[PDB]
Design a protein around this nucleic acid. Structure first.
Lengths: 50, 75, 96, 64
RNA sequence: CCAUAGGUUAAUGAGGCGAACCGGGGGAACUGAAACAUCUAAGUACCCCGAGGAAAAGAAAUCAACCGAGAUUCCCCCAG
RNA sequence: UUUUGUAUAAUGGGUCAGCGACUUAUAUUCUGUAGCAAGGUUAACCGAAUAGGGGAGCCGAAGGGAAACCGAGUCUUAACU
RNA sequence: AGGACCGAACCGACUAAUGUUGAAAAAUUAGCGGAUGACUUGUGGCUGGGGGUGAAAGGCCAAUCAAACCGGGAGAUAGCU
RNA sequence: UGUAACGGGGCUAAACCAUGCACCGAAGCUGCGGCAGCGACGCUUAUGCGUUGUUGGGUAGGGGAGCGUUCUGUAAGCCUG
RNA sequence: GUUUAUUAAAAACACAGCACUGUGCAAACACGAAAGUGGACGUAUACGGUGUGACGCCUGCCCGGUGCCGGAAGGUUAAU
RNA sequence: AAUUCCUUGUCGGGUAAGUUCCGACCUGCACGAAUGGCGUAAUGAUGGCCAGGCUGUCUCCACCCGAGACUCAGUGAAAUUGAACUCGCUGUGAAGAUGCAGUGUACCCGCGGCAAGACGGAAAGACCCCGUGAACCUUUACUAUAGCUUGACACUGAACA
RNA sequence: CUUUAAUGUUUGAUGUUCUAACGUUGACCCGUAAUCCGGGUUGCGGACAGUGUCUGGUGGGUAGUUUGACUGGGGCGGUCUCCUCCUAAAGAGUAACGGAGGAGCACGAAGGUUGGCUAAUCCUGGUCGGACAUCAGGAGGUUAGUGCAAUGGCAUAAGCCAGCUUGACUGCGAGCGUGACGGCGCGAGCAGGUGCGAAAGCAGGUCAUAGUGAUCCGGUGGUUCUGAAUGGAAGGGCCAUC
């Protein structure tokens, strides 16, 4: 519905991204989640609420 | 104004009492916890009860609420 | 592949891959041959001459697939591990 | 004549060592962020064509 | 005006027919796609021009691949 | 003949006689059978010409992988109980 | 004088009956309309198929017309009989 | 349309109820004779029998085994004025 | 008057008359790959198209929609 | 009203009696002004209604004259047709029986005649439905295209402001 | 460099004028005893018109086609996928244009864990204060709640509140369930790295069951896997994803 799709990109040098959905209207703030990076193999901070 | 129903989900008891199971085997695919998990039985995310060790299926009635457990006897 | 009008199996499944261009010029030599090469020396020619790989073939490989006996000198071909041991065990010589 | 291969079937099935055919799983091209990673991880390896369908496949692929 | 156009005469050749094969100029649709329009049928049917006992093509501004081959045409593979 | 079901008042046939409908070619798969057998077999063509040559090729003896590549293993994966 | 009036030839075809395996694949008999006109007729010519021609009915184009006839594509195709 | 709601005659039992013993009754079962399929089993061994058990309705359809026709070889043979 | 030759002759078609509209002549328009031809050896009192349909009394309001005619400022807008 | 469903509207005229006809009213389902409105003399093998005359149209048919029909001689078809030793009823039955069951009736064979049945004959129902059938027709369905139309380049230049 | 002034020069733009291309279905002459045509002279028009290629617009004038199925005949109406209950005959499944309802999402907390807590309603007392807003006590028992239908669940709470958080992880997966298949579902455990907790442990989303779309074609990021002489590249593959 209204809830958009965003890419959580990795803070390490890799291009690896998780992908998910955000309500852009009610939460306009960016979304930072310490997720797992399998190229670095380490839990790195992910950014970019699209 | 009518004429619709969902597809039948095929719930129920898949392995009955005394029936030998392997580990991992689904015993009761069901909807709430009509049957609860007992010894060597796990309860999945949709309340599917599955054999966590090998053995024989044991339906029992335990506890102060007369719940229907399902154990597995090691066999 | 006509299932009534349902989308057929060869058309509801995705397609994968590509064709190599290079696997059509590689070959795969057993050890049952190379007693057939007339010489006790094995190159791409000496195999082509023995009607065993084909003219278009550029690459060849000497897979363990049974029973080399005579001492054979393999030249310029890739040899697998097990068949390096089998060629060198029955006399033999592998240079590249 | 000589039998023509159903050509878009050759791009989708590949013959194996004992005559069965492997194929890539469906459902893993797009709409993907809605799917669990357990689905997607179980759809990546290639799979054998089942018993029902080998008749169709062998009919479409007579040289492979 | 010179001259060209035109006119007259003579010499040589052509014209038309013919079954298929051949080269070229044009060129469908039914059909198949379980509908249909891209696609197919198919450069097929047909129409037209021209030629020969055959025609056409043909003597690398061609391939190949760091080795080489050596014009064109036809057949069997390559290879569904 | 078609049908759930035809004495059916459902179809067809006035009768006789003659003709009248699962073929042919080329590929592929399985069964039988024959030859040879980790090998089998040639096509075009040459031709004393159904012989004999011709093994170009095709199929099989090795798979895995999208592919490089590896190879009785291989792919997945940083690595696999 | 008159797309004037009555009415034969001439052109037509309103009604009825017969006929309907007819005398006739459209007629006969009894009445009927026009009958100097936008008439009728002979002989020749011209227009052609998505085309002609049409005082228009989808009429007519050789007893064929919401697309002639012949030949070909062609054994079109027919999940239907 | 005609009795026309026992098939009919006809029945006061030839109706109904209860009990019992007879008999009729099918391509069922049995008897006798025959053929064929599938098993098992001692030989026969390349199969037949002293056997022996059991099976044999059949549409779509699958499997197996045959007869006839015309033509070629056997056949310049063998029948035939 | 004409029409469904062969089940419909009619209120239908036609018609004189009316109106609208196009057309300045190498006319519009039509047949025609084109040449050309008809329009017409005519010239706007003519010709083509469309509707209505002798005559008499008349033909009212609506330009928002669709079309046509006219305008060129601005927006958008192809090949290049 | 060629227009009006309700509707045989209501009133009037004609008729013994008038769903039609004529006149009128107007509540015009759903007239109406050049897809013309309303009148309209004459005309019409035009539509509707009334009357005089006339009559076999009819009450209700009768007789007669001819041509067939019928008999004889000659010639000599056709559609149809599984086979026939081809009755009625009542019932059964693929549900409307010459063929089944029960029963009743009926010597065998023709000729003239009638047409109730043989789901009679003729024509692979024209209606209805279906077919991923066809054809023509329409349109602001889709896709094209002829035609008309727009600009660029070509054919296609100079001399001055 | 910025900004300006004069000249020369280099090119485009526009308007007037011109004759020389082209048009002439104007006149005259000739081929020619010819209203065709061609040539000549001249007049008029004249870079226009016209035609070719390209291009926008218009285009039933014409052509090719499409215009669903279910359906107690077809049309008209309704429906078409997914979830819940009943029908459904005490395993599963089970039809009808049978009876009833819902979905085409929401959520970065409404997920994970740790620690804690327990509802509805009614009665009584009490400032504004009321049938019903807060307080206190009692009865009561989950008649409540569960992000949204219904069913099954839920107190060990799956309900309610707070602290810290990202396991809403990545690669796999014994074994099962469920479908004709495509597919869908459940899953202990293994490896890597993480959160909460003192720890045992729990966490691969949410109490569960709806919240959806195959393939092709193509877009974006990563990975030399390929890369038609060779080195690259383009394109393709693979992984993620739209």
């Amino acid at each position: 519905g209204i809830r958009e799709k965003i890419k959580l990109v990795s803070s390490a040098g890799t291009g690896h991204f998780y992908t998910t959905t955000k309500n852009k209207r009610t939460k306009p703030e960016k979304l930072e989640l310490k997720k797992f990076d399998p190229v670095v193999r380490q839990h790195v901070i992910y950014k970019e609420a699209k | 104004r009518n004429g619709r129903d969902s597809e039948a989900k095929r719930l129920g008891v898949k392995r009955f009492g005394g029936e030998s199971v392997l580990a991992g085997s689904i015993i009761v695919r069901q909807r709430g916890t009509k049957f609860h998990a007992g010894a060597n039985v796990g309860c999945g995310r949709d309340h599917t009860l599955f054999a966590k060790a090998d053995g024989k299926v044991k339906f029992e009635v335990k506890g102060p609420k007369n719940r229907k457990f399902i154990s597995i006897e090691a066999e | 592949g006509f299932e009534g009008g349902q989308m057929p199996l060869y058309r509801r499944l995705p397609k994968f891959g590509f064709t190599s261009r290079k696997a059509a010029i590689t070959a795969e030599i057993r050890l049952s041959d190379l007693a057939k090469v007339e010489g006790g020396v094995v190159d791409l020619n000496t195999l082509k001459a023995a009607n065993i790989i084909g003219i278009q073939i550029e690459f060849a490989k000497v897979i363990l697939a049974g029973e080399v006996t005579t001492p054979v000198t393999v030249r310029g071909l890739r040899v697998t591990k097990g068949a390096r041991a089998a060629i060198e065990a029955a006399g033999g010589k592998i240079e590249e | 004549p000589k039998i023509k291969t159903v050509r878009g079937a050759a791009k989708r099935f590949k013959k194996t060592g004992k005559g069965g055919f492997k194929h890539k799983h469906a459902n893993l091209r797009h709409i993907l962020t809605k799917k669990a990673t357990k689905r997607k991880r179980h759809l990546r390896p290639k799979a054998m064509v089942s018993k029902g369908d080998l008749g169709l496949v062998i009919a479409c692929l007579p040289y492979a």
